[PDB]
């Protein structure tokens, strides 16, 4: 019941139905194919298997561009059941059957096999949802000797770079800036998959080192061409001097075999006419397991590995198999939180407050993987680590003998603090949160030292404060606005569902990463709520309107805190002259999407309630 809604509420990927140029190409694919086979079928008669049929959407279109039967497969019961109604009240009812099958269990579709397979069926890397034996095996079993399939070929494109910026996603932090600084060993770094927006660097925070790499070609149109496993060692030539601190990773999809229609998902500086913005693909980001260093005009090789569902990539002597996290760093931490931490090793200022609030102290820190207390160390007297996680106690542990931090306790509850400290200081930081106010458990550790050590118990930050403003994102927006008519086709009954069981599973606020976003702010930050730092945790409710959102689409939310003298924000760190603001790399910001039937207002009327009784601050958007 919850499980099944849950994944309805997945089932519309973000933004793939309004993917304008992907429907373009897939529509471009079954033409040219649909085609072939009306002139090479004796009789013009034309079945079309449309694999991974979500609502329907390309089973419309192979219908509406003429094939005589379709039959479409979706092994996700409900969007299934949706398939066959949205198909069955369309003027291509009687062309269309929905199988609820996952492909690879049909043994037979009836009573011909298919001419043509069109599935959509990849995710940012490719292979990541099962294309390789969706389409291996629906050949062997489900398709007619020289069946077509759109898309009928792949390229998976690596570029090497220079990236500081890249580097902070990745690097075990170092608590000193040099290396050698090794505080827990060498790792590879997860083989978890990093999914960015990479059109939204900057230029100046990379530096391409080669011309891309096709690290692999697939052909969906030779079942024996498919192989699961393979590893290729692969040339290219440095056109600049560096080191490879990140392999920039995307793909492209041809769609009819023709060398001319694609889906390319190359970033927006390096696909200068296939280029299109989209959510529910992207790019990504692999690390090399040891450092390369490379020289123009030298030849120098990656080595490229994948399995049925990833992909990896090595240096060559180095071993071909997949390298997991051996630091427990990469696979605790989301990439953001290694961002943050390598943020906060570096930033000059936040570390000079930290030197002068600790100085000659007893400080004890609170959050949860917050590195905080390392950095205390330099100057302070003593330090006490609270830390309820085990493993993080165990990082912690390492970096502190690493370092020789001797002034450093590390202990897991706060309530086990008997000695008094001088100060409390947090970010605050725990890791638990999936929203930038769930470190509001800040409050409740604050509760529990105020009532064992006195009311008077110094404590930094001293105020938190949840923000708000409007803004126009370019294309985030369309992850959650409605399908309604898609290619002529009517999808809203897709959207009734989606909308019900996205109301019941999912949160009215979504998380982003919003440096990730290009968009222009409509209006000045607006205080929402603000913590005191206190005895007593107090509920609080308020309502305020939001002004400016006739042109706006969102509302992203934040949390700042004043840390001693400085002002640590989680979201906004500033705005262009131009209205273009920065976000912070090292969290996800809340955004707001206005609910279809407020598109229009020029101005919502935002409520929130932080509950002391959940440490949850509620929301809905209406009125005004
Ligand atoms: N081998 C398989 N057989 C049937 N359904 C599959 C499958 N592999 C993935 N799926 C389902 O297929 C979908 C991929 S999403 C693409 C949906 C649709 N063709 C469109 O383009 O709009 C998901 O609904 C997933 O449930
Ligand atoms: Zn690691």
Partial sequence: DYDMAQELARSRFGDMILDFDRNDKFLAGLKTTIAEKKHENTDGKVHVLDIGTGTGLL?????????????????????????????????????????????????????????????????????????????????????????????????????????????????????????????????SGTAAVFDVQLSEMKTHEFRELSEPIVAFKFDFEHEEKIIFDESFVREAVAHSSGTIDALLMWWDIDMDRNGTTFIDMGPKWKNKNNYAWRDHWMQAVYYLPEKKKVEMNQTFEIVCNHDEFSLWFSNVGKDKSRSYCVCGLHSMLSRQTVYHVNEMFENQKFKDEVDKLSKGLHVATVGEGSFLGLLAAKTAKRVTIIDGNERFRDIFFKYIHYYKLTNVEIIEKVTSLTDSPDIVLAEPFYMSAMNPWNHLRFLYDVEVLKMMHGDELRVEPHMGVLKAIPEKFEDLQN??????????????????????????????????????????????????????????????????????????????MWMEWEFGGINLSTGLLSISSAGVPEWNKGYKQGVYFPITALRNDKSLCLHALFDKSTGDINFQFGKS
């Fill in 59 to 187: 089973s419309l279109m192979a219908a509406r561009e003429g094939a005589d039967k379709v039959t479409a497969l979706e092994v996700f019961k409900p969007m299934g059941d949706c398939a066959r109604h949205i198909t069955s009240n369309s003027p291509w009812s009687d062309k269309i059957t929905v199988i609820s099958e996952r492909s690879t269990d049909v043994s037979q579709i009836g009573g011909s096999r298919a001419d043509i397979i069109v599935a959509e069926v990849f995710d940012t890397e490719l292979i990541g949802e099962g294309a390789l034996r969706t389409f291996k095996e629906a050949l062997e079993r489900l398709a007619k000797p020289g069946c077509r399939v759109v898309p009928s070929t792949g390229n998976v494109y690596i570029v090497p770079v220079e990236s500081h910026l890249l580097k902070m996603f990745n690097d075990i932090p170092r608590l000193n800036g040099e290396k050698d600084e090794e505080p827990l060993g060498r790792c």
């Fill in 479 to 556: 992850i959650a606005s409605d399908v309604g008519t898609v290619n002529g086709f009517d999808l809203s009954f897709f959207d009734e569902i989606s909308t019900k069981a996205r109301t019941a599973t999912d949160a009215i606020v979504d998380e982003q990463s919003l440096w990730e976003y290009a968009g222009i702010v409509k209006g000045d930050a607006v205080e929402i709520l603000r913590f005191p730092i206190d005895g007593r945790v107090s509920s609080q409710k308020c309502v305020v309107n939001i002004d400016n959102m006739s042109s706006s689409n969102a509302i992203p």
